[PDB]
Amino acid sequence: DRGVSTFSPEGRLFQVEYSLEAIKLGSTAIGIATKEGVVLGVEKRATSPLLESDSIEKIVEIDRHIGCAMSGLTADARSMIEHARTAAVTHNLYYDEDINVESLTQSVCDLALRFGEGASGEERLMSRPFGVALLIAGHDADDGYQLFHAEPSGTFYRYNAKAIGSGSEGAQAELLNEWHSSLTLKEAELLVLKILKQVMEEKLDENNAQLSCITKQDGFKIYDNEKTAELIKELKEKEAAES
Amino acid sequence: NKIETLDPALIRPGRIDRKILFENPDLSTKKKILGIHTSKMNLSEDVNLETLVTTKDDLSGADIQAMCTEAGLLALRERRMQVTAEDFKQAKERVMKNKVEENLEGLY
Amino acid sequence: MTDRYSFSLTTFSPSGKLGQIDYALTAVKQGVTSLGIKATNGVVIATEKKSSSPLAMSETLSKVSLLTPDIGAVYSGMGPDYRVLVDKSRKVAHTSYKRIYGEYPPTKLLVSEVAKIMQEATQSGGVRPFGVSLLIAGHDEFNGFSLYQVDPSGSYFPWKATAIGKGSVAAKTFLEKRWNDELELEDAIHIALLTLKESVEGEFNGDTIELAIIGDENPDLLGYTGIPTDKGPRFRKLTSQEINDRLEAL
Amino acid sequence: GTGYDLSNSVFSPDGRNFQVEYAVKAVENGTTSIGIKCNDGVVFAVEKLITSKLLVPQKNVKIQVVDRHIGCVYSGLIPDGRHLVNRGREEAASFKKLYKTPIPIPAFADRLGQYVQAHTLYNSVRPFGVSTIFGGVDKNGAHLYMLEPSGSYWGYKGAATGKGRQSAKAELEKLVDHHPEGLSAREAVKQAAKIIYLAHEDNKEKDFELEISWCSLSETNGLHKFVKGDLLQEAIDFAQKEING
Amino acid sequence: SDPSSINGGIVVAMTGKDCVAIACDLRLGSQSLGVSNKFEKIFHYGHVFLGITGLATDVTTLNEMFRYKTNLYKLKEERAIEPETFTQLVSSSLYERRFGPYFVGPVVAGINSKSGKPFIAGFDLIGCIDEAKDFIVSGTASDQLFGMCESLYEPNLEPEDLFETISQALLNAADRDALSGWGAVVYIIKKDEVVKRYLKMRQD
Amino acid sequence: FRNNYDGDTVTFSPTGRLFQVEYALEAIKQGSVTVGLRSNTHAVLVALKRNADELSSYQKKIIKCDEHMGLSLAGLAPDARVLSNYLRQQCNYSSLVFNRKLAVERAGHLLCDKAQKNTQSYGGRPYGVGLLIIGYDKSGAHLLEFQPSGNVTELYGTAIGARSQGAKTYLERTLDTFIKIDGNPDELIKAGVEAISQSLRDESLTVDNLSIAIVGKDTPFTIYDGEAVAKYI
Amino acid sequence: GYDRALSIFSPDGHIFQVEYALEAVKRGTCAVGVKGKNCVVLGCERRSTLKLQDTRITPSKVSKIDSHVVLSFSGLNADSRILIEKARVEAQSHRLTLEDPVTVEYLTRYVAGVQQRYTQSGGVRPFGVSTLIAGFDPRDDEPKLYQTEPSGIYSSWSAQTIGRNSKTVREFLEKNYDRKEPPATVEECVKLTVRSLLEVVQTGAKNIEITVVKPDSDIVALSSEEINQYVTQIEQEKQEQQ
Amino acid sequence: AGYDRHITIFSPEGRLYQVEYAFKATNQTNINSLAVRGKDCTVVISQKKVPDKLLDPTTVSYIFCISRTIGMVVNGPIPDARNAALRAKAEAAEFRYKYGYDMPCDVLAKRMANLSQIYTQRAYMRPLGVILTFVSVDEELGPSIYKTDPAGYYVGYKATATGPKQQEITTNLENHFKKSKIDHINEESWEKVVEFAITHMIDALGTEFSKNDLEVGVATKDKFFTLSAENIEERLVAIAEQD
Amino acid sequence: GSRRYDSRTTIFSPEGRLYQVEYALESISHAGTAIGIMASDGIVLAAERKVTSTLLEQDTSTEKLYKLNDKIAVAVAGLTADAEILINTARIHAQNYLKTYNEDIPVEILVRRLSDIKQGYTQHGGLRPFGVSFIYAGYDDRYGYQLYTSNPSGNYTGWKAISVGANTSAAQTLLQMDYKDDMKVDDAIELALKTLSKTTDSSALTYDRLEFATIRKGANDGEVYQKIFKPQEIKDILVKTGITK
């Protein structure tokens, strides 16, 4: 088919480049890490009376202190989660404590390398690389609240805020202006809603958005439909009184 | 025939902005396609334009053309210029089978 | 490192054919005139002996191999494919039957075992399929004398006379006309030399025919001169002098 | 023609696969190394290229030992030559255990030969693009051998390979004739050094640093050792005396 | 526990002339305690009859095994297995895993469909051959049975009389045990009719 | 054509080696500038750390393999990790089996072999990453250059990454001086920062890009990271 | 080795093989599920054109995955057996190990998971099948309806329709259902399901097979006789709205 | 599949391109061989040349001694010749342990042929190019010559030649054998057997060759030996002693 | 490796097809004909052997009729070779059901397995599939007489009259008309032979170009006794219908 070991004159593999193309087509995932929490928000999107829109969400829990929101292909993010749960569970049994979000990303990225015909270095069992990129957010007692962007290529960077998805070009640009080093959890969540409203071609409801948060008295916690909607209710009125 | 054999970089958006489909003649259209083709005819009064359209399952305008052309032949062979209903019906049964043949992957 | 080839090398073409089987068959058509006859009082198979060189032994050369004791095979096609195939056929025939049911496999059962080898090889990649066709002529005491054809793909069909190689059809015409069942083995040997003289011109001898029969017994083919316990072989390959003697016998 | 430029799993009509041709070519595209058989031993010498003063002497010697009495030097590409040798070593350790005797120079030729030949029956393994000149003293005499990348190899009286292959065979062929085979092992260091000098004349875009080693049954006692100190230093002088410039 | 005498069993086969007879007990026990008077140890694949005495389990494994071997052979050759042929098949299968446990004594009886001769065979746990053409016995009381058979047996018996020998032999052998009690069957066998006759014998 | 010999890693071409291999050598230059320098008693590694953004946090360009060893990468990240684990494995085993730390030389030659194997394997690839591996063993101070096709060279000084030739001119001049200072850490370190800023010509230097690692006769693997590199400029 | 590639990227960030899997489903027959708030109805086509089929041994479109759970499909039968078998095993695996009746969400994750594997993993291609999975969770009276694609993605849907003329049946259904007032009675929800599936089968009232699932293993397949009656009625309704 | 000469699979015509090219240009390596049968010996003459004065011609080998009694003459190149030698040697040795008996020419020929055939069907190996002539004086057949050739075809000879002076060698022996009514000459001593060989050789290839340009391998009952350089000149001078 | 030395024909197509499968059905449509008529006191089976001769045996009348059991048999349309592997394995799959539960396999289970193996050859492996279509002539006490066809794609459908092979189209058009919904064996035999002549070109319909088997209940034969007609019983039935012309 297409080479699995054949590089560009620069030296960037075809398969890596193609990995970058599926990512850009999902719905935005935006994280801001603050000093009291990590906020992860997604656009879930789609509203139909023939659709159960509040039974599907893109914010899935890995552990009692770790979530991930995704953007790109969703089917691919299931294999990534199966590997990640197994690795975290086995480490909690051996040393009784939290696994590091950076550590998790490296363990996963190792199995992202298989695709194609095998090597004599590695047994390549898959056919393509993963076509989803992830924002993995967590807490550890030795670096507090953190936010991480794993690319399926191998690179994983720590960030204080980062957006991924289709609408990331705008989103990131807004994140910087809104970002400061005295930002808190409660402000950050309101701001998420501002960003989400702006870039929508619709009215922001909780059957097209979902919030989530991290506090260290409860771990990774999903901001529920009932609370997320109350937050949406408060937004619409206050915005619509600045006009 | 299909547009999946043309490159999107030969179509060239911004000059060719429309790529227009072909949808099948539906029931109202069949009545019409027939209506035009039965005008040219000399036939029997037992023909029911309506009856033949209703049993036809969403069939092409080609089928409608074909049917008239086929029915005239069944009359010409029998040495006559009148075309009875039974003739239209046989032509309809034959073309409808061939279109609607696609077994074990359409008709699973 | 090492092979990774597991993709089938035999594949379907737009018509429903199999490229590799089509190719292999061209080789078989171009191969050495071989026939088989059931005389009803035996089975006689003849094939062309050839020499590479006059200074070359043709004792070593293999154009007629005994697959199992009462059974011989002959072919048209590709010589190297034939040689290996005979080997896998001999092995399974010996291990799986000769003290399990206490005797050789029946002819039809052995034709199926060959058929399977060829079909494994056609299905599976890493290797191209066998390029051969066999005429397996036989005797089994539960089916009489038989003649089968084994095709390159491993399709088989029953025959009571046939010929494959070059110049088949006309060879079958002469055989069809001269023999119609209930015939001495000797007589079928005579008919067989006649069909092949008309088929091969340029130089013809019984020193370029290699002839085997299944259709005799000697005490020597029980393999002992004592008191019987079993029947034993009925395969006997003739020497060149005996064949010249039957060429002299009108 | 074609299919034989990407593969080795099928046979050329020329009797010589186009991929095999490309393997030889990369050998001539390296440095010069040579090998001298003598009346008791073998002496090996190589031209080591000096490009910059950021390189360190005697840690990028291209002479690598196998066993105890075999010194192995090559022309072509570095990674191919080291992997080929690392395999020699492993077979050598195995040998020593099993037969309780050191690995022969003829044995080692075979060991290498079979690893190269294996990669020239397969399109799924890529062969080596180095020619390795090796030898030593063993229980059955002194040996110089040269392994070429086809999986052709023989014992020689003298050998060269590389950029400077031709100039080296010329200068060697005169000296060997004059002597019975190359006289003494002592003499052979001086002779070697002359050969390297003539071989340098095909480079002249880099300076060189002379490196010699020997295996001798009358002045080393059957071990492979480097030639350094006084002996190397008299050898530089001998070359520069007769060869002028 | 016992290794094969939980239920016990004995099996006798004899030849007439162009006919045979195969007879067996119908005991089922749990040790010396009799539990049931019916356990049929004779199965047939065409005109081959096969009785196997010993441990119940082991008998089953061989019966289904010969059932699998006979079925694919029958289907492929278009021919049912003959006794002579069947004897080689019993031997070969025993040889295949004699280092697996077996506590069996299969006994074959049948009349050939290719040589017409009455045919009997005995088999052992390791799968030694008994070629015999008078009588062959196996089982727990085999020592006794060989003594009884060698003296009682009269050859070339035609069905009515063959019946009398095999039944009376069997009834009187059985009475020196109670591991051969709990009813008995005689099968008197021709190609043309097979008669099955229940006997009346003791119980404990 | 290009496309003819490019598809799998098992073919040679008239050039003497495969196209793909050159593209692996090319990638190193894309990734981060790292200079390597030694005297004869200590050896110094200086590396520029790059990130992507303001709100991104740095990716580490020093990965510590032992408490007497570490390496810098330049080029492709994912392979640099797969290699640093292999080197960890190699190191530990040496200590478990032989009580041995693992020489720079000794490691280089094992690493080379691994590299040939992954360039004869067809689905396999060149790593696409070069490494400067430093150590002080009982062989003395060392710098080695590793290239992802199995080319291993022992050097006084060198650079991989952005304008390697750039740094190399600097080092080759100041060479004779700094290398004879044997027993003063600080000087060799100070020469490292002086060099690296002159290779640069479309970037600038700053404190938290720079990170310095020294190993030696009396310096066990120690990183000066962030703030503490100021006092070597 | 046949662990090497057989599924590759698109330059558009799709996958070629998943785009081609969906086409086989479209050419195919039509399956639909419409929800009440007491039942979940599944309609499945059986459009026997020919009369030489014997239809008690002509394959059905309804499988038990579990006693309270059904799977229906549109796509190649051959592929669908392979998926159907793995899904029955998984219901029994939970039952054995957790000592608990099966929950619908986990099964859906399982069905999704085998298809997802075969796109990702080398020397295998995804199935030629899209499915609908529905049933009821234990001790629960609210309906559950899931859709899975051979891409391996998965969703819940209040109602969904698949195979040939999916557009037509969505579009219709959208006018006859609200989440705020879905149907309470079996008769009227079934009437709606039969009416949508009439409009695409063409002639059919024995060619339409309805199976209505009420809470916890009350699963009942309505018959031809019953269906012919609803079609009569529909022919009376269409001249009350004229 | 692929193609019919990028991997080994049938041609359009049912031929195999690889076996026919294996016949041709593997005998044009400056090699020409003949083998003739003695009375109680077997003689081989084969060309064998060294183009340098710096190539030790002792190591140069193309008659190999497979066992103490068995010889194998290879026509074709040293990379191939050693793949076949390793196989031959192994087969010889294995045979000796297992079957308790010395390895006949014919058995070795047959075994090697079938093996080459398998490598011919493989799509990741080649048939070897070499033509292998296996010689001894068996105690189970007398002097023997059996030759395999590369296609998996092999056949026994009483006298053979290879290289494109095949016709010349054959005709001289044929006329001779038709007259004398024997295909083996009668003479005890090996010396007279080598002289008979040379007579037919010199006439047929139309030239005489030096000591170091020849290599002569002699099979005797329970020995195979190669003639030293002086020993090969002794014979060339001995016919010229007659002249 | 094998990437550019192989191809992928086991992938999907821009219609949703698989290359080799679609093609496989084509191979079947020019192979010899098999016909299945299910009656309600029997099963009547007919097959045409296309081309017969006095040089072939016509005596073997199991050539396309194989018993897989004494209760299930298939009629084959396609190759002998392709057929052989699924027969042998099906017979084995039988014995396993029989051993486990002491009762013979239903028809439906055995079909579903067969189809899964056939799907398997295109689903993984890269392999090629078989090119033979089977007509299942079979029994249940749940379903009465059963008549199936299964294809290399692995789709399987229930029938009471079906054909595969050549001239499928002609046989089925006459058959649907002349069918009686519940009928005796002898009536079936009349209907079959009548259909058969007029699907065989010119005067050709003979006993020795036919293979016939019927599966009757009997009352001197056992329930579901399959009689695979040998030449002479074909000769009889042709004369009784008078259809030999």
Swiss-Prot record, chain A:
Its main location: cytoplasm. Keywords: Cytoplasm, Nucleus, Phosphoprotein, Proteasome. The modification Phosphothreonine is found at residue 47. GO terms for cellular component: nucleus; proteasome complex; proteasome core complex, alpha-subunit complex; proteasome storage granule. InterPro entries: Ntn_hydrolases_N, Proteasome_alpha, Proteasome_alpha-type, Proteasome_alpha_type_5, Proteasome_asu_N, Proteasome_sua/b. The proteasome degrades poly-ubiquitinated proteins in the cytoplasm and in the nucleus. It is essential for the regulated turnover of proteins and for the removal of misfolded proteins. The proteasome is a multicatalytic proteinase complex that is characterized by its ability to cleave peptides with Arg, Phe, Tyr, Leu, and Glu adjacent to the leaving group at neutral or slightly basic pH. It has an ATP-dependent proteolytic activity. Belongs to the peptidase T1A family. Present with 17100 molecules/cell in log phase SD medium. This is Proteasome subunit alpha type-5. It comes from Saccharomyces cerevisiae (strain ATCC 204508 / S288c) (Baker's yeast). The lineage of its organism: Eukaryota, Fungi, Dikarya, Ascomycota, Saccharomycotina.
Curated annotation (Swiss-Prot), chain B:
The lineage of its organism: Eukaryota, Fungi, Dikarya, Ascomycota, Saccharomycotina. It comes from Saccharomyces cerevisiae (strain ATCC 204508 / S288c) (Baker's yeast). This is 26S proteasome regulatory subunit 4 homolog. Belongs to the AAA ATPase family. It comes from the Eukaryota. The chain holds residues 329 to 436 of 437 of the full protein. It is found in: Cytoplasm; Nucleus. The 26S proteasome is involved in the ATP-dependent degradation of ubiquitinated proteins. The regulatory (or ATPase) complex confers ATP dependency and substrate specificity to the 26S complex. Has ATPase activity.
Swiss-Prot record, chain D:
GO terms for molecular function: mRNA binding. One of its GO terms (biological process) is proteasomal ubiquitin-independent protein catabolic process. The keyword Acetylation applies. PROSITE patterns: PROTEASOME_ALPHA_1, PROTEASOME_ALPHA_2. It comes from the Eukaryota. Keywords: Acetylation, Cytoplasm, Nucleus, Proteasome. The alpha and beta forms are probably products of the same gene with different post-translational modifications. CDD domains: proteasome_alpha_type_3 (cd03751). Disulfide bonds: none annotated. Its main location: cytoplasm. It is found in: Cytoplasm; Nucleus. One of its GO terms (cellular component) is proteasome core complex, alpha-subunit complex. Coiled coil: none annotated. The proteasome degrades poly-ubiquitinated proteins in the cytoplasm and in the nucleus. It is essential for the regulated turnover of proteins and for the removal of misfolded proteins. The proteasome is a multicatalytic proteinase complex that is characterized by its ability to cleave peptides with Arg, Phe, Tyr, Leu, and Glu adjacent to the leaving group at neutral or slightly basic pH. It has an ATP-dependent proteolytic activity. Present with 12000 molecules/cell in log phase SD medium. PANTHER family: PROTEASOME SUBUNIT ALPHA/BETA. Belongs to the peptidase T1A family. This is Probable proteasome subunit alpha type-7. The lineage of its organism: Eukaryota, Fungi, Dikarya, Ascomycota, Saccharomycotina. The gene is PRE10.
UniProtKB/Swiss-Prot annotation, chain I:
It comes from the Eukaryota. PROSITE patterns: PROTEASOME_ALPHA_1, PROTEASOME_ALPHA_2. GO terms for biological process: proteasomal ubiquitin-independent protein catabolic process; proteasome core complex assembly; proteasome-mediated ubiquitin-dependent protein catabolic process. Pfam families: Proteasome, Proteasome_A_N. Gene3D superfamilies: Glutamine Phosphoribosylpyrophosphate, subunit 1, domain 1. Belongs to the peptidase T1A family. The proteasome degrades poly-ubiquitinated proteins in the cytoplasm and in the nucleus. It is essential for the regulated turnover of proteins and for the removal of misfolded proteins. The proteasome is a multicatalytic proteinase complex that is characterized by its ability to cleave peptides with Arg, Phe, Tyr, Leu, and Glu adjacent to the leaving group at neutral or slightly basic pH. It has an ATP-dependent proteolytic activity. Present with 17100 molecules/cell in log phase SD medium. This is Proteasome subunit alpha type-3. It comes from Saccharomyces cerevisiae (strain ATCC 204508 / S288c).
